[PDB]
Write an enzyme that holds these catalytic residues in place. Structure first.
Site, short mmCIF file in Angstrom:
data_model
loop_
_atom_site.label_atom_id
_atom_site.label_comp_id
_atom_site.label_asym_id
_atom_site.label_seq_id
_atom_site.Cartn_x
_atom_site.Cartn_y
_atom_site.Cartn_z
N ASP A 192 -37.28 20.01 25.32
CA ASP A 192 -36.34 21.10 25.56
C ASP A 192 -37.09 22.43 25.57
O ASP A 192 -36.73 23.36 24.84
CB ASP A 192 -35.23 21.13 24.50
CG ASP A 192 -34.04 21.97 24.94
OD1 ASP A 192 -33.98 22.34 26.13
OD2 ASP A 192 -33.17 22.27 24.09
N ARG A 240 -35.27 30.24 26.68
CA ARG A 240 -34.21 30.39 25.68
C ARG A 240 -34.60 29.78 24.34
O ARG A 240 -33.96 30.08 23.33
CB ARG A 240 -32.92 29.74 26.18
CG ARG A 240 -33.00 28.22 26.23
CD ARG A 240 -31.70 27.59 26.68
NE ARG A 240 -31.88 26.18 26.96
CZ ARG A 240 -32.26 25.70 28.14
NH1 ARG A 240 -32.45 26.49 29.18
NH2 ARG A 240 -32.44 24.39 28.28
N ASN A 241 -35.62 28.92 24.31
CA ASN A 241 -36.03 28.23 23.10
C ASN A 241 -37.31 28.79 22.50
O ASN A 241 -37.77 28.27 21.47
CB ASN A 241 -36.20 26.73 23.38
CG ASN A 241 -34.91 26.05 23.78
OD1 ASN A 241 -33.82 26.52 23.44
ND2 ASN A 241 -35.01 24.95 24.50
N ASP A 248 -36.64 25.60 18.65
CA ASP A 248 -35.64 24.61 19.05
C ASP A 248 -36.23 23.21 19.04
O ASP A 248 -36.02 22.41 19.96
CB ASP A 248 -35.03 24.95 20.41
CG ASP A 248 -33.64 24.36 20.60
OD1 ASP A 248 -33.43 23.18 20.24
OD2 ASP A 248 -32.75 25.07 21.11
#
Ligand SMILES: CCN1Cc2c(ccc(F)c2C#N)O[C@@H](C)CNC(=O)c2c(N)nn3ccc1nc23
Length: 298
Positions: free
Chosen positions: A157, A161-162, A175
């Site tokens: 992932d 955004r992580n 994350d």
């Protein structure tokens, strides 16, 4: 502390010894439940005030896990994410510890990031990141993944955004492990047969077809991350909705070159998007190809 055997009595013995190495005393943590910094599927992320051994009051983010109703699933989550206690890299979000409590859920303590996630930092119309500054972020993410890959750990992932930014503007892959959750509810598709949460516009072609993740699918995802940085946080594949991505990627089509992406860096992106996973560069090759492009900016 002996609180592990009580507050986490559903844990496998070896995991009991693992989580015991990282337990935080309740007197050392102050959870500002009224100062919520965000939410997620598994629970909320609050503000925190951790007190170290010497006495330093360290700002931290505390992840609540109350939404995991099954107490046996909490043990699986801790089983899959406890390995992160062994990870120590400047470009990888470290784990400060776990605060345990019966009649409640275990609290995961992560250090605070002043400038939040990397995507909302570069999309913000008030900050001025030069092209060199954005490539510096990508180089750090490649350093973090090089360490994670060296520990035989698959992120599955990896996205802007992580990744996070601290006070000194150091990028930290996050994350993952005990800090893993779902914080953006528009980019993930929930598998109806396995339950896996899939970032379809970030997964490798072979990952969309078989639902597996290797150390080469994160290289593909790292390619999106470099595309995001160049476009300063534009949504990938805007004209292709989530059902045509797979067919879009089987024809050889890829993301267009951003208006301010240097040609050598785009070349790195296409390498990450090789249809054959074994032809994609390792994160060690990426850390040398991107660092060379970043050093021409003297
Ligand atoms: C549990 C650790 N998480 C949660 C978290 C997110 C968003 C993206 C992420 F990859 C992670 C992670 N891993 O939470 C989002 C709802 C918003 N998180 C924040 O504003 C945040 C911050 N400013 N420092 N800081 C430190 C840690 C932290 N989150 C933060």
């Amino acid at each position: 502390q002996n609180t592990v055997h009580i507050d986490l009595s559903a844990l496998n013995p070896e995991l009991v010894q693992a989580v015991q190495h990282v337990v935080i005393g309740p007197s050392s943590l102050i959870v500002h439940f009224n100062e919520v910094i965000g939410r997620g599927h598994f629970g909320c992320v609050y503000h925190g005030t951790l007190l170290d051994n010497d006495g330093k009051k360290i700002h931290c983010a505390v992840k609540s896990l109350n939404r995991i109703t099954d107490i046996g699933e909490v043990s699986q989550f801790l089983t899959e994410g406890i390995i992160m206690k062994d990870f120590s890299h400047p470009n990888v979000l470290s784990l400060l510890g776990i605060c345990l409590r019966s009649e409640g859920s275990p609290l995961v303590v992560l250090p605070y990031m002043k400038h939040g996630d990397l995507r909302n930092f570069i999309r913000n119309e008030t900050h001025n990141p030069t092209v060199k500054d954005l490539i510096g972020f990508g180089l750090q993410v490649a350093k973090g993944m090089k360490y994670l890959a060296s520990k035989k750990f698959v992120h599955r992932d990896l996205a802007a955004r992580n990744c996070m930014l601290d006070e000194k503007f150091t990028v930290k892959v996050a994350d993952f492990g005990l800090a893993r959750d779902m914080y953006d509810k528009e980019y993930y598709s929930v598998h109806n047969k396995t339950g896996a949460k899939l970032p379809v516009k970030w997964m490798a072609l072979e990952s969309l077809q078989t639902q597996k993740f290797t150390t080469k699918s994160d290289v593909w995802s790292f390619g999106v991350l470099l595309w995001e940085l160049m476009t300063r946080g534009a949504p990938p594949y805007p004209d292709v909705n989530t059902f045509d991505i797979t067919v879009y990627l089987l024809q050889g089509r890829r993301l267009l070159q951003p208006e301010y992406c240097p040609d050598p860096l785009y070349e790195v992106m296409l390498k990450c998007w090789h249809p054959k996973a074994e032809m994609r560069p390792s994160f060690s090759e990426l850390v040398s190809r991107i660092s060379a492009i970043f050093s021409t900016f003297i």
